[PDB]
Structures are given as structure tokens and as C-alpha cells.
Amino acid sequence: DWNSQVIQEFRANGGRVGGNFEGAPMVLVHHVGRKTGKAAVTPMMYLPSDDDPGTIYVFASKAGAASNPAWYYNLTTAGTAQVEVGTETYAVGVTEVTGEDRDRIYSEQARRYPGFADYEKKTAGIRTIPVLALTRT
């Protein structure tokens, strides 16, 4: 609904959204419920890979809530997805980033948007915020 308006806005503005997402790199992630089988489209920020053209990182942050978001399980279950980035739409392979690599990519995101550091303080001792790599195929 809201979700719907953010998606229309993304698509009207070359892959950009205002409000809380003003100036941020956005992606619309098409995923499918690992239990329901139902398609959904979730807009979110990404961080582009500094090492590999065609790879973006997304953050299963869910505003520092207690649980991982449903899209996280949907993506890692399917192993592949479709995304809209910029004016494009393409298939992606999904892999989860872990260890010191996760920490480094999360630190760059939190550097650019320090709200991300608050999410991690909110989830301390509860969950580690997953980072996924979406790689263009």
C-alpha cells in the first residue's frame, strides 16, 4: 500500500525514492514466500560492491527489530531473485556474507547511514543483521 506507493515512486523516478530513502541507492527485490509461495516486491536500500561490478549488498535490518524480515528467508531459500535497480530489471544469484566480511560491508553502510549502527545496537545479543550479496546474472 505504502509499499505500493514507494514502488510507483521508484519506477517514476529512475529508481529513486524520497522521504527516508532520499538520495539512497534503492532496489526493488522480487521474492517469493518460502512457505506461501506468493510473490512480493520489497523496496530497500542497497550498498554497491566496492570490488565487483554487478554485485549489490542488502541488509536484513528490519529497523533493528527482534526478528529477521521474511524477505531474508525467502531469498536465501530460493538462492536467486529478480531485482529492479536504476532503470534496469535483472536476475540475481543470492549468497549470504558472514564473518569479518559482513562486518566490513555493514560498517560502510553504517558509516553512510548511521541509523544502521543504531539497528545493530538494538539487536545486540538477539540477532546479527544479515547481509546478502545480490549478484547480477
Residue numbers in the entry: 6 to 142
Quote from the publication:
Herein, we describe the isolation and characterization of nine F420H2-dependent reductases (FDRs) from Mycobacterium smegmatis that utilize an F420H2 cofactor to catalyse the reduction of aflatoxins, leading to their spontaneous breakdown. Structural and phylogenetic analysis suggests that these nine enzymes fall into two hitherto unclassified enzyme families that are distantly related to the well characterized FMN-dependent pyridoxamine 5′-phosphate oxidase (PNPOx) family. The mechanism of aflatoxin breakdown appears to involve an initial, enzyme-catalysed reduction of the double bond of the α,β-unsaturated ester moiety, followed by spontaneous hydrolysis.
The three most active enzymes were from the FDR-A family (MSMEG_5998, 2850 and 3356). To gain further insight into the function of these newly identified enzymes, crystal structures of members of the FDR-A (MSMEG_3356) and FDR-B families (MSMEG_3380) were solved to 2.0 and 1.2 Å resolution respectively. MSMEG_3356 and MSMEG_3380 both adopt the PNPOx-like split barrel fold, comprising a central split barrel surrounded by four helices. Thus, it appears that MSMEG_3356 is the first characterized structure of a member of the FDR-A family. Despite their low similarity, the structures of both the FDRs described here are characterized by large hydrophobic pockets formed by several aromatic residues and a positively charged groove that is principally formed by several lysine and arginine side-chains. Consistent with the level of electrostatic and hydrophobic interactions implied by the docking results, titration curves of activity versus cofactor concentration show that both MSMEG_3356 and MSMEG_3380 bind F420H2 tightly, with apparent KM values in the nanomolar range (260 nM and 130 nM, respectively). In MSMEG_3356, the deazaflavin/substrate pocket is formed by W7, N25, F26, M31, P48, M49, M50, F64, A68, W76, F121 and Y124, and the positively charged groove is formed by the side-chains of N8, H36, R39, K40, T41, K43, T47 and K67. Also, the MSMEG_3380 cavity is significantly larger than that of MSMEG_3356 (649 Å3 versus 411 Å3).
